[PDB]
Nucleic acid binder design. Structure first.
Ligand SMILES: [Cl-]
Ligand SMILES: [Cl-]
Ligand SMILES: [Cl-]
Ligand SMILES: [Mg+2]
Ligand SMILES: [Mg+2]
Ligand SMILES: [Mg+2]
Ligand SMILES: [Mg+2]
Ligand SMILES: [Mg+2]
Ligand SMILES: [Mg+2]
Ligand SMILES: [Mg+2]
Ligand SMILES: [Mg+2]
Ligand SMILES: [Mg+2]
Ligand SMILES: [Mg+2]
Ligand SMILES: [Mg+2]
Ligand code: NA
Ligand code: NA
Ligand code: NA
Ligand code: NA
Ligand code: NA
Ligand code: NA
Ligand code: NA
Ligand code: NA
Ligand code: NA
Ligand code: NA
Ligand code: NA
Ligand code: NA
Ligand code: NA
Ligand code: NA
Ligand code: NA
Ligand code: NA
Ligand code: NA
Ligand code: NA
Ligand code: NA
Ligand SMILES: [Sr+2]
Ligand SMILES: [Sr+2]
Ligand SMILES: [Sr+2]
Ligand SMILES: [Sr+2]
Ligand SMILES: [Sr+2]
Ligand SMILES: [Sr+2]
Ligand SMILES: [Sr+2]
Ligand SMILES: [Sr+2]
Ligand SMILES: [Sr+2]
Ligand SMILES: [Sr+2]
Ligand SMILES: [Sr+2]
Ligand SMILES: [Sr+2]
Ligand SMILES: [Sr+2]
Ligand SMILES: [Sr+2]
Ligand SMILES: [Sr+2]
Ligand SMILES: [Sr+2]
Ligand SMILES: [Sr+2]
Ligand SMILES: [Sr+2]
Lengths: 246, 145, 119, 115
RNA sequence: UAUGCCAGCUGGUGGAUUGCUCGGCUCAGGCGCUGAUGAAGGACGUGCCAAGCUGCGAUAAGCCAUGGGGAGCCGCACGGAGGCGAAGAACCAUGGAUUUCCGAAUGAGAAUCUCUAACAAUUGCUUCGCGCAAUGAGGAACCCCGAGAACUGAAACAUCUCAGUAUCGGGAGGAACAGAAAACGCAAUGUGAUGUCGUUAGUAACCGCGAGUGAACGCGAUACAGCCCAAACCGAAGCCCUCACGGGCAAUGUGGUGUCAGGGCUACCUCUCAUCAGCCGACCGUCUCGACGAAGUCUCUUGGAACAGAGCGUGAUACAGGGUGACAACCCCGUACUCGAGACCAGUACGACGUGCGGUAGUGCCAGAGUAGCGGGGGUUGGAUAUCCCUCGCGAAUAACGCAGGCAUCGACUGCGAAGGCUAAACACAACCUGAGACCGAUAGUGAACAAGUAGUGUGAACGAACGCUGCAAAGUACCCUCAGAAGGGAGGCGAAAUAGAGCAUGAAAUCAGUUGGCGAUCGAGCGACAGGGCAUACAAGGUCCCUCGACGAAUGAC
RNA sequence: GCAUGGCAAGUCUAACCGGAGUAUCCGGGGAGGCACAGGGAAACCGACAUGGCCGCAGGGCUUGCCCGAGGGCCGCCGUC
């Protein structure tokens, strides 16, 4: 198909062939698998101290004093799992492999599939993104990379009737639970993904919920955060073409 | 919901009487204990058998059936076409870490072929010739006598 | 760091010279223009206006600045004890705004007026 | 409990045609695709060449692979083809998706099931 | 109706629950030796008042200098009194001063003290004098060299296994160890020091041929780096101490040459950029620390408090995280960008100084002995005839010789020179620094969020807990009454709240006091389930239910 | 073993290398493993891309008659 190119003013400026990959059939299961793997692969190994509760010469008295055969020390029960201060029976272990494998072909298919979900307005809107545009994704002249001020990207997105998504992501959620005690108090909706070619857009990156990426390494996650296909994306003239051979 | 996930409240977790799942007594001994006594069943029998030659006095031949060669003749356009002429050595994979290449005669040969290899089986020749083809034994192949 | 425990910790355990930053307050519009800064370290000479607590709206001279507890006493911002005496009600500088500076010290004044540095 | 949404839709479409048109193959093929993956057909060209005949659409309730030689000019309809398979088939005949076949022949006539 | 049963209400007891996190746990990156110049550790001191912790050392929570920093300060710890600071204190970085006693502990001795100048003891050098030096002890583990179990598995058990594990002795470093072939043996016209990682592979090999044990060559990677003696030939041409004078060493050989691209020697060709020695000396990168750093504290409403809702506005190379009286990019610290310094990389790379590589011909001049190798006895190993080592005995050749190529001998062939030595980098650990988290969240997580290795137990080795939360602000309750009373009580004051008043957020159950409903001093025990009656019931969150008659009317079914 | 998914006469990379948004992730890396031939202690030799008959599903026809993947019973082939 054909994709309309836009200049920094938001005005149409020609158009190019939307590469074939954007015609790849949308596979939400494969995309979900790819995201699941990337998310698991950055998780850190953990586990309780292997000697926790075992630092005691506590012994059981056996039969004779009308007491249960529980190891005790200084009249205090210890070591065994049912004992307060005793070891953890089957605790988290550091040796556990918490990574997930994924064949390269299967993973690459998911990327292409997530790329394709990007060219379907209905899907993008179903994913949740807010915008008053009909053609998707949004293609822009390579001059986008030369931008510097965030506000300048704001103007362009407003001109492109796509800024509404950032307004959506401009609401943080203070999560329920103890994640907060560990530095995970907030979370927020995912908005626009900016795909450039030379370097990630420093000008766009700070926008609420925005993500920046480069055509050579944009992955399933930025294309489908959380495994949900159809992210409102904005490519760069060259990014669009580079992405074609992924 | 998995089987594991449904065990809470069952007490025995599918083990039967709670007196069953204890130590190795429940398995008749550890590892292959009793492979000649209580658990002799289905175990390979006891004993020594045969011998082994030293690994560096052993030859590993690289083989291929005419069927493989013949089915890919046209596709093997990067290999001689005459009155096809094919040096099997340039066809067989693993033809480097092998001491020699041998053409086996499994299948059919629906073309006239001129095959070059270190060795052929009786049936490999009968078929190749029988289809208006020939067989050329390499210099290394000059180890038959 | 990003971890909350470490953040609060580095703040509660900060050495004295690093506690001045815990007694900084935003400057009035005029002063910001005059010294090209958005805020400054509140001194016991400065005049300040309360913008948030139960005493929001009041202005007065800062009578004390406690680096140990990172708080300040402002004239007339007090509480009435049981015996009737009047004691100061400590204020976080974050709820205050400086409307007049005490520049009786050349160093502070020099620091304020320099550009490469903030006071 | 299939995971692939496309396989899931193909099965639904196969039933729609079997129930609407006078096709019994489509419903039959549907039933096989509903069975576990390990039972699905995995056929090489050599088998199609041996039992297929021209003008009789070959239907594979699985995937077609590239071993062997296909000479007959036949239209093979399968759930999927390997890259090489689809190439060899197109050289002497035609490779079609089970989804196209259902559209060009809802009645499912003159078709031969191969596995 | 007493004693009393069941349920609830008000108050308690108790500290569950929810919420919170100054502590843990685990991972990652960086970094990494200390000590006779007396360490690490301990003891005892040290404050205006000072018990504990922290710091410090008779200059005793500190003294001095330089830089930073800044109007405050006098540690944890919010007291009283008093003091210090513009003579620029506090605080931070770097360097320096002081630094009791015991402690390797070293003049002798000793439960931290004493007695009459001390490297005690063992060594090297030696001016033969402790004159100059070394060693000793510590460190989380990691590392190297020695000593070396058993429970256990084999469903018994002895070989085997657990396992060269636990534990013990000795010793080094920041990493150790190994290492430039008497190699390999995909046998080759082939590879080319050594670790390590992936694989080769549970393969070959071992084994009551049971259970079990278990490599290597190679290959793909990481990192790369190669050299020095002994002798031949020379023969004092030399080295060490000292400013010097001078002294010591050294013909039992200092020094030159040389080191399998074998060397030397005699005769030649050419030439040096190899090596070895020394000089100089980084970039970058990584880690940490630091400087700078945009934009609202606007209106209304609620509230004790706006960080809430609604309205208006703004920054963003900064919408990580934290703080602030409640959900904060724009109030404060920070964060992005940019910049500065220290450490590590590294005295390395590069560069430069000197030295001089190599080749031909001749020459049986040189080339590491209880060795190579064999036998007896053991251990060990996958090592099987064919692992590595110990022990007793025997024991060779001399490059024209010798060793190896998985049984022995002989020939051939291919490889390679043992019995002297050094060697960067790539790899192990986690004390120390920093960062991180689908980890735990106060009976959890460390034994330890608190006085924590504390209180406490044991003659000793050693063993070893529990205890987190007032409030926005102490505004931490003035005055009065009562009382033996700084107790407690009453009244009162503060605050949004005292049912937030001191282990003071919330405040479960067990259970206790008082009390409400039901039952109750002639009556029977798994305490109930299902039916049906009594009595009891504020609202809210359920709104149905009863009787006459009529309609419908299954099985069944009359007087 | 099984369920699901990718690729398919092939399939997967391992250590590790480069990139980067720097433990994620993008690219590279096929060493090697398993599969693609077996039989035999070994030496060593080395196979049905179909020859026959039944026949399920499905398809076809002029509605019992044909074609009949998979399957079933045999032949035949490799090796000891
Ligand atoms: Cl063999
Ligand atoms: Cl097949
Ligand atoms: Cl080799
Ligand atoms: Mg525990
Ligand atoms: Mg919760
Ligand atoms: Mg200024
Ligand atoms: Mg002494
Ligand atoms: Mg046993
Ligand atoms: Mg043994
Ligand atoms: Mg046995
Ligand atoms: Mg072993
Ligand atoms: Mg080997
Ligand atoms: Mg605890
Ligand atoms: Mg309470
Ligand atoms: Na303990
Ligand atoms: Na792990
Ligand atoms: Na049991
Ligand atoms: Na370090
Ligand atoms: Na004290
Ligand atoms: Na000191
Ligand atoms: Na000494
Ligand atoms: Na002496
Ligand atoms: Na046993
Ligand atoms: Na026994
Ligand atoms: Na044995
Ligand atoms: Na090779
Ligand atoms: Na504030
Ligand atoms: Na051994
Ligand atoms: Na011996
Ligand atoms: Na050898
Ligand atoms: Na507790
Ligand atoms: Na009742
Ligand atoms: Na390969
Ligand atoms: Sr007894
Ligand atoms: Sr079971
Ligand atoms: Sr047990
Ligand atoms: Sr068993
Ligand atoms: Sr038996
Ligand atoms: Sr290979
Ligand atoms: Sr303080
Ligand atoms: Sr304090
Ligand atoms: Sr090398
Ligand atoms: Sr030698
Ligand atoms: Sr031999
Ligand atoms: Sr407790
Ligand atoms: Sr612990
Ligand atoms: Sr005792
Ligand atoms: Sr009162
Ligand atoms: Sr009736
Ligand atoms: Sr691959
Ligand atoms: Sr058949």
């Amino acid at each position: 198909m054909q994709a309309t190119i836009y200049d920094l003013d938001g005005n149409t400026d020609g158009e190019v062939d939307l590469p074939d990959v954007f015609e790849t059939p949308v596979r939400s299961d494969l995309i979900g698998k790819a995201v699941r793997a990337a998310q698991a692969n950055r998780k850190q190994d953990y586990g309780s101290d292997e000697y926790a509760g075992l630092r005691t010469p506590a012994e059981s008295f056996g039969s004779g004093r009308g007491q249960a055969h529980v190891p005790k020390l200084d009249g205090r029960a210890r070591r065994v799992p049912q004992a307060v201060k005793g070891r953890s029976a089957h605790p988290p272990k550091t040796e556990k492999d918490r990574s997930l494998d994924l064949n390269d072909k299967e993973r690459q298919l998911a990327v292409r599939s997530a790329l394709a979900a990007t060219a379907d307005a209905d899907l993008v809107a179903d994913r949740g993104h807010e915008f008053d545009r009909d053609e998707v994704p949004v293609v822009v002249s390579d001059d986008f990379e030369d931008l510097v001020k965030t506000q300048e990207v704001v103007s362009l997105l407003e001109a492109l009737d796509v800024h509404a998504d950032i307004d959506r992501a401009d609401e943080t959620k203070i999560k329920a639970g103890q994640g907060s005690a560990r530095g995970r108090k907030y979370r927020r909706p995912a908005s626009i993904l900016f795909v450039t070619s030379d370097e990630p857009s420093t000008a766009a990156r700070n926008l609420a919920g925005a993500d920046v990426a480069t055509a050579s390494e944009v992955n399933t996650e930025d294309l489908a955060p959380g495994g949900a296909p159809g992210r409102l994306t904005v490519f760069t003239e060259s990014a669009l073409a580079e992405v074609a051979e992924r | 919901t998995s089987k594991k996930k449904r065990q809470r409240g069952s007490r025995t977790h599918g083990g039967g009487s709670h007196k069953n799942r204890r130590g190795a007594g429940h398995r008749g001994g550890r590892g292959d204990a009793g492979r000649d006594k209580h658990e002799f069943h289905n175990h390979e029998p006891l004993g020594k058998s045969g011998f082994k030659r030293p690994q560096k006095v052993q030859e590993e031949a690289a083989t291929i059936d005419v069927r493989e060669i013949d089915e890919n003749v046209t596709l093997l356009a990067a290999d001689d076409v005459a009155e096809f002429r094919v040096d099997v050595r340039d066809v067989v994979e693993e033809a480097d870490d092998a001491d020699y290449v041998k053409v086996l005669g499994a299948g059919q040969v629906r073309h006239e072929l001129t095959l070059i290899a270190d060795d052929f089986s009786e049936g490999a020749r009968e078929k190749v010739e029988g289809a208006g083809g020939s067989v050329e034994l390499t210099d290394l192949g000059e180890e038959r006598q | 760091s990003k971890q909350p425990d470490k953040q609060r910790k580095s703040q509660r355990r900060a050495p004295l010279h690093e506690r001045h930053k815990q007694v900084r307050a935003t400057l009035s519009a005029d002063l910001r223009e005059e010294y090209g800064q958005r805020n400054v370290r509140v001194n016991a000479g400065d005049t300040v206006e309360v913008l948030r607590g139960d005493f929001a709206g009041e202005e007065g001279e800062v009578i004390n600045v406690d680096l140990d507890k990172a708080v300040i006493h402002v004239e007339d911002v007090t509480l009435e004890k049981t015996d009737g005496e009047e004691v100061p009600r400590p204020l976080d500088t974050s709820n205050v705004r400086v409307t007049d500076l005490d520049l009786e010290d050349e160093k502070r004044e020099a620091r304020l007026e320099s550009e490469d540095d903030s006071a | 409990s299939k995971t692939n949404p496309r396989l899931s839709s193909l099965i639904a479409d196969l039933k729609s045609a079997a129930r609407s048109s006078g096709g019994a193959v489509w419903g039959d093929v549907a039933e096989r695709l509903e069975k576990p993956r390990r039972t699905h057909a995995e056929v090489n060209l050599g088998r199609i060449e041996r039992y297929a005949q021209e003008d009789e659409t070959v239907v594979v309730p699985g995937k077609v692979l590239g071993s062997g030689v296909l000479q007959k000019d036949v239209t093979v309809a399968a759930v999927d083809f390997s890259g090489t398979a689809e190439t060899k088939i197109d050289q002497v005949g035609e490779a079609v998706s089970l989804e196209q076949a259902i559209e060009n022949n809802p009645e499912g006539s003159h078709v031969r099931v191969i596995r």
